[PDB]
RNA sequence: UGUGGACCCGCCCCUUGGGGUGUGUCCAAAGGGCUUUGCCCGCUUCCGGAUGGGCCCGCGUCCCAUCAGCUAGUUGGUGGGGUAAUGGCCCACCAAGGCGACGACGGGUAGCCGGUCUGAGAGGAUGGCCGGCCACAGGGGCACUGAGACACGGGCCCCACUCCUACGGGAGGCAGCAGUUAGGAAUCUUCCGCAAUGGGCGCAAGCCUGACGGAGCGACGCCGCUUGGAGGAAGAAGCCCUUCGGGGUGUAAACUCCUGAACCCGGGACGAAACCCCCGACGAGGGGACUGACGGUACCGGGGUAAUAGCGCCGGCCAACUCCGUGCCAGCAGCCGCGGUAAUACGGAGGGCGCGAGCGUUACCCGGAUUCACUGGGCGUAAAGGGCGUGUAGGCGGCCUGGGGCGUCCCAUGUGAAAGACCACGGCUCAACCGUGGGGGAGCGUGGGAUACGCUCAGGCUAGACGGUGGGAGAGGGUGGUGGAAUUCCCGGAGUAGCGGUGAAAUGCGCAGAUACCGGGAGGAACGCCGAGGCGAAGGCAGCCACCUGGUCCACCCGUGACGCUGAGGCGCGAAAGCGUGGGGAGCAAACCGGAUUAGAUACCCGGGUAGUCCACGCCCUAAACGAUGCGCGCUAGGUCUCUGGGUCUCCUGGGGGCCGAAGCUAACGCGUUAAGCGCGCCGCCUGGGGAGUACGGCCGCAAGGCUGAAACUCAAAGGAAUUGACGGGGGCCCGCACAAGCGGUGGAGCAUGUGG
RNA sequence: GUGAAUACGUUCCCGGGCCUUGUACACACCGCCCGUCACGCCAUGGGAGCGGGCUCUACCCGAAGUCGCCGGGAGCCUACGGGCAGGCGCCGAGGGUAGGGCCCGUGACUGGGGCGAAGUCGUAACAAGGUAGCUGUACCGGAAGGUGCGGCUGGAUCACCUCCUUUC
RNA sequence: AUGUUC
């Protein structure tokens, strides 16, 4: 029944992102949604959209690759290279804003659930609070 | 593990052996020689090794490597036991400190002295 | 006397026994000194302060579950007792509670913290010194006195031990400072002084203070300093190597200058200004006097001598190599391993490297060890998936809206003592050491705030889950029956000389007529073809028929509305063998008897043969119980064969079973929408090999045995996968006088000759 | 000089080549290796028992001391309602006796275990290891082991099957 | 058919 929905997302989109998918599908949330919105935001995403697959509602994620590469393995670049759930139903995460990590020396984001809403380590920092690690990206 | 798993288990810390029963956890040890004897080393080596069966203060009779060329234990010698075993001889566990109590130092030794407890020879 | 206070009761307020108030009762006291109608010290009661405490509560606080049940003042109540005070603290009475897998109880270990050591950190280890708290004072109980003690140098008793004794009795408690003795690898002066700071008593003078301040001893530790500095040869001697020219020690020395640790001379501290005395008032404020253990020390000035250096290592890790001696000896050794006559690994020399008043060793802690893995590991074959279901606690929980604000985050604020750590500036000539100031710091309390996520309550949805209707495939299970083939045996017939069996034989069966053939019958076990796939959670399940019965798939999209996943324990199921009571017994067949084979043959081959294999009931509970792969869910190319549903059916769509493969993973082999990929949940398990699935204990079992499951000691590996070989009483293909086909010899005889002896 | 025989064939013997296969060998099958038995050393389990430590249960005796009742036909004080002595009792350190639990030590002897350069017997395993192996179980045998039943492939040379796959 | 060892 899923036992964790984002993570299962995060999941969608790694899959999708390794054998370089124009989209993918996620059934909906709003929470799902808010995380969709930074990753656009931060650009490992095109964006999304709503849908509605078999009278469901989804999030179809329109992924996002670098340029086709030279020699053997062509293969695009990830602009997703690494993107990892932290907190999670089996061990919830929570930090407070003065020990929020700093991901990947700045190149990455991590991603939180805040009382202020959804925000990167940095809009985070700057608004002072803290919350859930959802997860990082890189 | 899953972290439930590890809530309710937890980890067990490590916890090891002594090689050495000097009891206490002493780092030395006085003992009268039983016995002195020489055996015969571990299959790849040949030698007539010198050896004292050492009754301890610690309450505890073991075998004790003689170091050095040459030694004068006999069968009551007083003996300062160290701990540190010889991979040769099959349960001896530790060596004498020549040098001390009724164990004499090395004669003629002038290159590792202090080991094998040899005085400083006189440059007259 | 009663300012006041205590107590019962009533009243008001307050809200656990807090504050007030009324009447009743009950409760105080101590004097001493002076220069004396005034001062100083004391005495009594009450109120408030300050300081120090007691008791209580939340949370935190090691190892064993081979410790799983614990508990009688035990849990609670009522009324007492007790105390400063709550309280089963203690006691009567009543009730029958209280605690425990969120680990009670028990056993083992341990004083706890600030800190400390290590570490990148998270962690790990530790808790000597200094600070804080606790406990103890020869062992055990006990109270007294008191503001306080159940009292370290107070008391009682018991016990242990010692001492004096005139034998009547007495005395004692260094875990205070020193010291002795014993134990030990090992740890100091029976030091100086109260000058300082602090403490007790006193109006004061002052007394006391092994607290303390100092000195001493110990390289035990850290910091600092010295053993010279500058010059000085293409380079003495000695000693080492040598290719007999040299090379090394080495500017090292000798030698010239220079400086001047120690020494000796002179001077000489800070730390000490109070208390006290006088003016003032015995206040503030001003003035005076005493006082130094350390110490004739630190330090300053003046003279002034070239003046201790050692320890470890030089095979690799690891920085640093030659000669001799030695010859698996002597010896080295942390691991790999060195040593067998040219050893950079033994011992010595020279030479070198590394530290240096030290250098090594042993012990112990952290590191390295991501080798208990939170950070940060794993289980197909390396150690590791539980034999499989069912399910308890527990852990985790789809989509939407609202309320709450416990988690969570934010702000403020309190607390987080000092010392230590960290930053800055300062004091000792530096540093160590020390001062002063500064920033931190999780935790926790209080107030305020946020609501994304987690939680919770309320409502909602239908994608998960269950259900209805309709269809289906199936060795899924159970009970009853009944069908043919075959084997055996019995009764017959017919027929006659062997059958059987092996590599070959024999045992055995057979003239009392076997074998082969036919008829009659019995009885037991298993179901040929179909037949490869199918069903089941696993184990496992195969003739046909009937009854009973479980799982499962699909379709309609009809009902419920998160009802879900997993699952420590528990319960049940669990091949074969095996056990118990019965039955049954054809074939087979452990053991066993015979025959062979063999060096032996307690085996393999042959002839027999008992349990057992079969059935009922009851046990046992294991396994290569295997996919050596826990369950559930989602996500990530396809191709092809196949089982079984559905389909405006040349393909689509679901559920299973296979093979090949995308991406990806993997040590590799391999796995790959039936994952060993990508992820979330939950369970189980691993932590080198042997010892050992052993011992001990405990549980289960009728027994066999099962489950749970160590350590000593030992080894430096055990091991996975793949690679190159080599090998095979493995395969394919292929060769040579290899065999085979031939012809002639050797082995016998004499002798020649080489050899063993 | 004179001067033959014979070769079907490659199954077998000795040696060898190429591919393949299994391997626990790699000093490479003249390899490895298993168990009894024999010897030595070490550490252990069991063992008639013996000896401690701790602990629990019941019963008996019970010091000090607080506390409670009495203090009378009873002494001493008095501040005579009282106090003190004195007496009884509870609890009680400990001690005694009996039986359990746990832990330690030790014990004639004894089971197996590990280690011991070249012990005896056979040859179980590794190559179809010469009977594929391994496995739970059961019986038997100096010893490895064998044999029964069932399981596993971590075995099978074949074969022919079906699948995959590559045809061209 | 068997057929050990170094
Ligand atoms: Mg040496
Ligand atoms: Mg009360
Ligand atoms: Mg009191
Ligand atoms: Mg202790
Ligand atoms: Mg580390
Ligand atoms: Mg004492
Ligand atoms: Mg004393
Ligand atoms: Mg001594
Ligand atoms: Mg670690
Ligand atoms: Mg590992
Ligand atoms: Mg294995
Ligand atoms: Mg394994
Ligand atoms: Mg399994
Ligand atoms: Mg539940
Ligand atoms: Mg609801
Ligand atoms: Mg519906
Ligand atoms: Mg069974
Ligand atoms: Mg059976
Ligand atoms: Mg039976
Ligand atoms: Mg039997
Ligand atoms: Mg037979
Ligand atoms: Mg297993
Ligand atoms: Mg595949
Ligand atoms: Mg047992
Ligand atoms: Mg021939
Ligand atoms: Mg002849
Ligand atoms: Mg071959
Ligand atoms: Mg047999």
Redesign the interface.
Known sequence: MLTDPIADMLTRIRNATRVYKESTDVPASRFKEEILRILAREGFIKGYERVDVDGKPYLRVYLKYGPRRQGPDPRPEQVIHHIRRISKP??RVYVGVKEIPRVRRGLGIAILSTSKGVLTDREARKLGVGGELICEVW | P???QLVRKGREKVRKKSKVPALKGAPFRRGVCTVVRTVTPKKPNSALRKVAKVRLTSGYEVTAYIPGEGHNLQEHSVVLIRGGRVKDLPGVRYHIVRGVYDAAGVKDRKKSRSKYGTKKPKEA
Do not use: S
């Open positions: 089996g061990r | 899953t972290i439930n």
